[PDB]
Design a protein around this ligand. Structure first.
Ligand SMILES: OC[C@H]1O[C@@H](O[C@H]2[C@H](O)[C@@H](O)[C@H](O)O[C@@H]2CO)[C@H](O)[C@@H](O)[C@@H]1O
Ligand SMILES: OC[C@H]1O[C@@H](O[C@H]2[C@H](O)[C@@H](O)[C@H](O)O[C@@H]2CO)[C@H](O)[C@@H](O)[C@@H]1O
Lengths: 822, 822
């Protein structure tokens, strides 16, 4: 069943009940200031750093979930309710939440009073704004008091929830009931000491009263749903000193039948130069100049509406690079809106904060920085260029990489360190995709240091060479790359051997040496090793290119011999040289990552889809028979039913979850792309639909999480909860699925020398048109598609038939019409 | 006003309402297994390690506070309520909670149904036991369904509340409806992998049903107060797979009028050897032998009642060493019961877990390990001796110490490190108090390594020497000790200079060198420097002793000259050698720590209380005028009203909290002891009453926290919340107050050559008798006390008058009667 509908015209997902299977959130903010916002107004906001700069507090694993957020308590003749339903849970006559791009609206109505709240983070502002419209929909007069509410965090969210021995004595506010445009509250904890910033929470009208102490507003022994002040009907005017600061104003609203009142609320982050921190000589009063300025920009509904308009303009203008129009509304909305929105949110949020990730850890995988780039580079190429230099600047001089990148300081994580041997090859993945999209070969000449050491600068190209050579110099007894701490699968730790709780599976190595190899890195090395070789050749390094190709050919041979189990690729050789992912074993017979990635790299592909004998086809057939389910493909089969001490974290999961039998959505695209490669477009599209939000909307009760974005993990067939997802929003599943559908299913993909048009989607999409803007020109690509396996597109370019699948790049400003038949 | 009363006959604090100012807690467990238990059954339990071995989940900063614990949902004809009042908050006809020594009882009655629960951790057991008695107090038949409830934690509490991306998929249980003695639920998360332990939650009767999935038991959108299963009236028999494991059993109870039913619940921690983990060849079923054995030990009320009696025997026999009988019930109950209980609790729990300390950090101050020992050494001398050996074994070879000690591993915290220059001297404090209490000079000969390095062992005495010499070799331009990172005041960081949020004030040193000195360490060196000297002398090291005395005399001279401001002692010299704690400055004119500690050490003491001119008397008179308030003495005055960058954490607190004008109780005793030293017993006893729990009971509404234990911090006079306490239970205030009243006010204190009897308590306690067990003999000390300033006791020993205040130690088994007149 469903709990909402898509609104394609508005670019919103419309949630039509409070009673979803789980809280469904949206992300506000496109620059430095961000909010997490559930369909019940839950969540929080922070400036730049979700661990050290959080404005407002939020409780994970609360009972009930998501009780805490931006509330507006309506007191109507003594009856108290919130339009967000939570936390009060008073019966509503009407409820709706709409999540759009960078903004959401939530509307609740009860006993003749409707409250609609628009939430957004404006362009160019460090604030979350609410436009609130209160309407008397009854036939009688209403006289209301509305109590706003936000609970402040003491900035360092880790300290805030752990260091009470100090932090219950540090909470400080200032109250400004007569602000130039209404009433305002300032949360200024530790502004007295080292912080040059405070938060402001304010309303564009004179508040009848206020509260800044949570215990007084809520009352002893009460939940948020039973808050005492709203029930009493008057603000207690509480001034916090320590404990739990909050922001609340009471606003009197009197309405004739049918009449409406609009209010604008602002939660703002304000920083002052050090020399301008104080209003007074005694340094007791915060300088409010900047806060007043912000509040003056949102004093009226007209300013707020214009800011909202400017937000939509931003998203509408940003999403102008790739669209599709077909017979399939679900495909179209995923491609044009939601998949691309999600990719942008991953770039903005990294892996900081979701309703699963808690905002305390601040880095993301080095490998993930690169892969995320694959999905946003067509939208923000300038930013992508900068990200590539920033991450490559952290790389070690021997070619190895920090496993975790800290995007806020542009440094590698020193505690975690290096030794995950797939990491360095992803830098080649990132840079090639960047150069194919933009044509900007000049990024290869940028000066880039190693481990951020001044004076160590070499060309970015030289970094790619050190990434390539790292794998060459780190191969094991079969010529396969040594896996080291782990490969893409961070749970496959063959050099760990842990039997002590609390030891990190990723960084603990209780035995040194060994000969553990990865076929995943082999496959990766074949694919990105060739992309390196091509860049070396174009750079005019004919000898470097050719040597590189030689190493790639040897790796291809190794995969197809020592790496090949008979009907699929092995997964690895362990510390002692024993096979992993072989049919000789009872569990973990076939693993998905090699099968998809190796075939993506062309390994074992034969004459065409009918060539059953081809290793590539045997492997993908094996995947289909042993790993594919109704909800996508599981990571390996069978799942391990006992702890495998020589394999690290993988077997610690109960079967059917995460890396031990879960559908790890991120890797499903590699097989989908593999299927288009071998010429089985219908199978490819099928696998895509199995895990794609628009297509899973009909089973929201089984999926449970957001029906409009991808999740990392869907419980596999061996789990009782099979079909149920965890870890929505922040996952490279978004980039890889966007790459898959845009470039391989729809088949429109940037190349150095032109735009390739190679659709392989099968019969379910008989006709479609893609509009792609590439190198300053617009390509209108109309496809008539039989969907037959092995049939590839013949192109007519501007009315004239052409040979091959490559369209020459046209000059900036051009429009190019391409008709395709297959 | 009050919320209860002491019951001295039962040794319990009786809480007579649910509606206390704050959750008031007790500690269960005297060995490896401990529980935090509030008067609303809130809190949690862990085995040994509260960070990584936590059985059950607890939410700090919940709304409302303390909503989560061991609950028993009573469904009576469809009406649902809990005898702990929270979480349901149904109106109770009767409520009472009694906290005793190692157990509590909570009783609730509503609509003719009474439910009493006794909570305790038995001696020799790693479990929390509930004895539940349900009585039908109505004139009608009653048919009830009782639902037990506890929420599991996923063992590692830090992971539990931060790493959802993994741990929402790892919850596992096994259900045993037909357990040999009732029904049992096993929480076995990560038992599959590296954990050799699991938890069992069980009842000594056949449960009608069960639940182990929180979301099913409680229902979506619901608080614990609205749990759906109890309201439905029948268990859902949910079996957890991931998400949030719980333990819950429904039991059917039918009662005629006046009829009662007893039930015994067990929460148990169970560990199997590796070769004994599994019941089955396939390793899917936990080996339950040890669990069934535990459960068989609490299968009946009789077994349970006998275990309860053995727990009372344990605490009664334990507290047989020091007691007083006077005219003052408040003094007597603090000295005989609550103060010594709190001291045992601090040894058992270190600084791990309270309702303010969250159980994640696992270490405690090396300085606090020594100070806590001062207050428990008379009870557990054998355990004290071991603790001294353990902490000294971590000491550095240069005499410096780890600032933080980790009792669980008996190692120093490497990340925090050393450099807090008061730390080494406290090892002398600990060892001297131990040897005085026991006569065990043999401890000084123990082999003890440095920094736990095999082969580096030297006699414990040599560790004391390196402590004493460390101070000698680390003195400033005035001959005062260099302060280093800080002294006892962890917030006096004169070598920090931080202007960046997130830098640790204790470990960050942005300037090296400087000349900062501490007068507190000076006074400390005078006091414990002399004690070391006396030990070296007794050891027969005449040259060493005299030389130590020479250094101590020099330190005295420094304190009284360079360390003296005119009417009180300076607090320090800062990094550039400017004075801190001087009347020349507007703020921080006088600091408490040096006044109290210098006079305890005899520095500036004159002819008697009559001698106003004596610096000790000028300093204490200044402390009285400027720092003493109705709630105790504040740390310094005035408090700093702007950030002092050159002083570190201290001025970051708003005035009147923690180290910036807070009443930091821990330090009040040094002045109380000082006042007995100068012969002002009435003032000493006054100060003692101002911060002591039995005397603050009648102002429970101001104090806010537990009226039966000391808290670390009472808000000072410059704070709007002046009088309100934070950080109850785990604080060196306990040891220092017990030393103060037992050895200085009451005046019974062990020395090497006998028992000193030197009462100085003022007129408010005209007569009292102390019974003290010391070196195997019992001393009955009967005191008649005029309370006059400077009047000191004249002793008659077994009927014969003696000179001096020292009673020779009698042979083990003797009774000695001492009569004192002053
Ligand atoms: O292995 C897939 C994926 O794992 C990510 O690491 C997770 C992992 O999924 C989880 O099981 C483990 O408990 O925690 C780690 C995070 O420390 C990783 O971020 C991805 O890059 C990787 O491809
Ligand atoms: O300074 C007194 C007391 O401080 C304790 O350290 C605390 C300190 O009270 C607090 O202000 C700061 O924020 O936290 C630290 C803990 O890191 C310390 O444990 C005691 O030894 C010391 O005597």
């Amino acid at each position: 069943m469903r709990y909402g509908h898509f609104d394609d015209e508005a670019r919103e997902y419309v949630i039509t009940t409070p009673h979803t299977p789980y809280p469904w959130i949206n992300y506000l903010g496109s620059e430095q200031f961000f909010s997490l916002l559930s369909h019940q107004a839950g969540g929080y906001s922070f400036y730049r750093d979700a661990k050290m700069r959080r404005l407002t507090r939020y409780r994970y694993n609360n009972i009930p979930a998501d009780a805490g957020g931006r509330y507006l308590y309506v007191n109507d003749g003594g009856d108290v309710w919130t339009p967000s339903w939570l936390p009060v849970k008073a019966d509503l006559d009407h409820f709706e939440a709409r999540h759009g791009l960078g903004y959401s609206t939530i509307t609740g109505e009860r006993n003749g009073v409707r409250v609609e709240t628009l939430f957004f983070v404006p362009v160019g502002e460090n604030a979350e704004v609410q436009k609130v419209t209160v309407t008397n929909t009854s036939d009688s007069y209403k006289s209301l008091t509305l109590f706003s509410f936000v609970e402040f965090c003491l900035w360092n969210a880790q300290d805030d929830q752990t260091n009470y021995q100090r932090n219950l004595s540090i909470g400080e506010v200032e109250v400004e009931q007569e602000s130039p445009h209404g009433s305002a509250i300032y949360h200024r904890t530790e502004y007295r000491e080292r912080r040059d910033h405070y938060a402001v929470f304010a309303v564009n009208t004179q508040a009848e009263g206020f509260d800044t102490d949570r215990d007084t507003f809520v009352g002893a022994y009460n939940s948020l749903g039973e808050a005492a002040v709203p029930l009493k009907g008057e603000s207690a005017n509480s001034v916090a000193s320590g404990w739990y600061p909050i922001g609340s104003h009471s606003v009197a609203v009197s309405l004739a039948p049918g009449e409406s009142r609009e209010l604008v609320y602002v939660l703002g982050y304000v920083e002052n130069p050090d020399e301008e921190k104080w209003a007074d000589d005694a340094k007791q009063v915060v300088n409010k100049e900047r806060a007043h300025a912000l509040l003056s920009r949102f004093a009226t509904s007209e300013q707020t509406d214009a800011a909202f308009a400017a937000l939509k303009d931003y998203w509408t203008d940003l999403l102008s690079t790739y669209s599709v129009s077909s017979n399939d509304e679900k495909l179209d909305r995923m491609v044009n809106i939601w998949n691309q929105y999600q990719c942008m949110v991953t770039f903005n949020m990294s892996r900081s904060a979701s309703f699963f990730e808690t905002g305390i850890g601040r880095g993301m995988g080095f490998r993930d920085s690169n892969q995320d780039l694959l999905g946003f580079v067509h939208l923000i190429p300038e930013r992508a260029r900068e990200r590539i230099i920033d991450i490559a600047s952290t790389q070690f001089a021997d070619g190895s990489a920090y496993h975790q990148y800290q995007p806020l300081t542009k440094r590698g994580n020193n505690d975690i360190g290096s030794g995950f041997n797939d990491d360095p090859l992803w830098l080649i993945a990132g840079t090639a995709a960047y150069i194919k999209e933009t044509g900007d070969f000049s990024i290869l000449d940028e000066p880039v240091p190693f481990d951020n050491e001044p004076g160590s600068e070499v060309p970015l190209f030289e970094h790619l060479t050190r990434s390539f050579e790292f794998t060459v110099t780190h191969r094991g007894p079969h010529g396969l790359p040594l896996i080291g701490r782990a490969d893409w699968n961070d749970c496959l730790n063959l050099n760990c051997f842990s039997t002590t709780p609390g030891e990190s599976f990723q960084t603990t190595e209780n035995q040194a040496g060994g000969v553990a190899e990865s076929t995943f890195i082999a496959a990766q090395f074949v694919l990105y090793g060739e992309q390196y070789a091509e860049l070396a050749a174009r750079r005019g390094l004919a000898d470097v290119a050719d040597r590189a190709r030689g190493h790639v050919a040897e790796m291809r041979d190794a995969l197809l011999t020592d790496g090949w189990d008979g009907s699929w690729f092995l997964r690895a050789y362990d510390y002692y040289g024993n096979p992993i992912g072989t049919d000789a074993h009872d569990e973990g017979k076939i693993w998905i990552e090699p099968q998809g990635f190796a075939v993506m790299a062309g390994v074992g592909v034969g004459e065409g889809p009918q060539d059953t004998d081809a290793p590539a086809i045997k492997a993908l057939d094996s995947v289909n028979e042993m790993l594919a389910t109704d909800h996508g493909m599981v990571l390996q089969y069978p799942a391990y039913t006992t702890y495998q001490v020589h394999m690290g974290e993988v077997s610690t999961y109960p079967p059917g979850y995460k890396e031990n039998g879960g559908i790890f959505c991120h890797n499903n695209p590699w097989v989908i792309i593999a299927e288009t490669v071998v010429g089985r477009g219908g199978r490819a599209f099928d696998y895509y639909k199995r895990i794609t939000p628009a297509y899973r909307e009909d089973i929201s009760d089984v999926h449970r999480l957001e029906p409009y974005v991808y999740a990392q993990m869907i419980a596999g067939k061996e789990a009782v909860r099979h079909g149920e997802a965890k870890n929505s929003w922040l996952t490279g599943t978004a980039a890889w699925n966007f790459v898959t559908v845009s470039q391989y299913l729809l088949g429109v993909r940037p190349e150095y020398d032109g735009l390739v048009v190679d659709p392989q989607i099968g019969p379910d999409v008989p006709s479609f048109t893609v509009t792609r803007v590439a190198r300053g020109a617009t390509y209108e690509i109309t496809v008539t598609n039989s969907g037959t396996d092995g049939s590839r597109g013949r192109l007519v370019v501007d009315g004239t038939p052409v040979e091959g699948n490559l369209v020459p790049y046209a000059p900036a400003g051009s429009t190019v019409r391409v008709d395709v038949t297959l």
